[PDB]
Structure 1
Amino acid sequence: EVTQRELFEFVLNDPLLASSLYINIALAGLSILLFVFMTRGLDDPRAKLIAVSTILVPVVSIASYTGLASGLTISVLEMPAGHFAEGSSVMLGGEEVDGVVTMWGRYLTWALSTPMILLALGLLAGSNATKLFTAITFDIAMCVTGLAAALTTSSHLMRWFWYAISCACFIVVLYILLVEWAQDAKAAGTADIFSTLKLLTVVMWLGYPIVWALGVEGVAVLPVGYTSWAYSALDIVAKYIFAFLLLNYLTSNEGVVSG
């Protein structure tokens, strides 16, 4: 029964964690600023919907990373027998504690920012509501089952079963990104930029389940701090730059996306 203060200090006291969380808190703040600045020239209602859903990305990121930073959304979990990190222990407060410091707050950041990325990207491609619906529902399911995979301590096989369920919902989203919106963007006149934002997205998105698998939640070839910086690095790219790359195209082509 560790304290939130204990986790708040454990992080401050760990090189990798402290930096992995605070550098992204910093970059998220510098994004909300650069983006509110970049998008002042917009006036069309649709261009402005794409702008604000995009801007919400770093808004969700700064708040959710603060949840981790404060120790509010981190837990110490004891992994199941057979799990590569079972047996782990951590110095918290004045004692050794069984378990792995688990920053499950990362799934809350993901559950909140991915539907905004899909909404902005969907509108960019001129998607109809059905595909928008399909993408966002399976995306939320993908994130929430991943979180349940992370939170499952009862059994090792059960964790990988959730992982599989999360993979299946990922495939539906990948199909919409790669086969449906790739085609829809042509009617909307956004094919060029879509292929770029889609290529980045699909590449960075595929990275998450690979890291999960090799990182501490999986077979742990990557320690807690490195599992964290890998996720943090992927976030800076899949999120802030993605938002910069999409917003640098938008505030140059307001007419194409209007209506």
Structure 2
Amino acid sequence: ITGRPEWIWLALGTALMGLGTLYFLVKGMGVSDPDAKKFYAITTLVPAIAFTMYLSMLLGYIYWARYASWLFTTPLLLLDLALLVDADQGTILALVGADGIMIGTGLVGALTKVYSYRFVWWAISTAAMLYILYVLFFGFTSKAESMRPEVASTFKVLRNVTVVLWSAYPVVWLIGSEGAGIVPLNIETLLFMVLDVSAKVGFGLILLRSRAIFGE
């Protein structure tokens, strides 16, 4: 069983999410700034949730826990960004709403019994994602630019990383088993794991290493 590629990617994901969680916990100890503490809580929770979900897929070894993890973590990552640019509550609610639709229709597309329809759900989900990225890239950038240089600079990096990583999910899904079935399952699992770790641990490393989280 341990020789199967599928199991290996799940095991590596579990290890990387767990290590990232522990490292963020270590980095956060000592920090007393009220503002920085909020970022540490959110950013530490994200890989912790993914670790539990990745561990679950290992114990179950199934990918239902995948969408469950995305359902919880994507809105948290959005909160992280919203907090950095001090976004309005109305805009935050719209983002979370679109995010729920994105993950939700994504699951419906994975569960659909008939072909052709797989892409209908993928299209609706991708539209939801495009709205989110449009808000992050054009909307949030304006607010960040009117903020402290450290904040404007860090937001732009996180934004660029988020846009690229999130955009890769619909591509992988389409070429994977839920879509056209071009790429084998083990490769698709590898791709999603790499994206998950990069979007959570990588994203968190960039954010938490920055002075932009402090109130100052």
> Normalised by the shorter chain, which TM-score bucket?
over 0.9
Matches within 5 A, 1:235-250: 235-249=196-210
Q: Which residue of 1 aligns with 2:123?
A: 164
- 1:207 is displaced (CA, Å) by 0.3
Cα RMSD (Å): 1.6
TM-score, normalised relative to structure 2? 0.93
- 1:254 is displaced (CA, Å) by 4.8
Distance 1:179 1:213 in 2: 26
Q: Which residue of 1 aligns with 2:86?
A: 126
> Which has more strand, going by share of residues?
1
Matches within 5 A, 1:97-108: 103-108=63-68
* Aligned: 1:183 with 2:172: no
- 1:21 is displaced (CA, Å) by 0.7
* Aligned: 1:135 with 2:124: no
Q: Deviation per CA, 1:187-238: give whole Å up to 9, x if none.
A: 3321111110110110011000001011111112210101110111111111
Q: Which residue of 1 aligns with 2:24?
A: 35
Distance 2:103 2:31 in 1: 32
- 1:181 is displaced (CA, Å) by 0.8
- Kindly indicate whether the alpha-carbon contact (under 8 Å) linking 1:126 and 1:187 is maintained by their aligned counterparts in 2: no
- What number of residue pairs does the alignment pair up? 214
Which 4+ residue blocks in structure 1 deviate beyond 6 angstroms? Answer: none
Distance 1:197 1:37 in 2: 22
Residue from 143, 150, 153 that aligns with 1:192: 153
- From the CA coordinates, give the structure whose radius of gyration is larger: 1
- Kindly indicate whether the alpha-carbon contact (under 8 Å) linking 1:138 and 1:172 is maintained by their aligned counterparts in 2: yes
* Aligned: 1:24 with 2:27: no
Matches within 5 A, 1:76-87: none
TM-score, normalised relative to structure 1? 0.78
**Gaps in structure 2 of 5+ consecutive residues:** none
- 1:147 is displaced (CA, Å) by 1.0
Instruction: Indicate the percent of aligned positions where both proteins have the same amino acid.
Output: 33
Q: What secondary structure does 2:116 align onto?
A: helix
Q: What secondary structure does 2:180 align onto?
A: coil
> Which has more helix, going by share of residues?
2
Distance 2:103 2:38 in 1: 24
- 1:18 is displaced (CA, Å) by 1.0
- 1:159 is displaced (CA, Å) by 1.6
- 1:174 is displaced (CA, Å) by 0.9
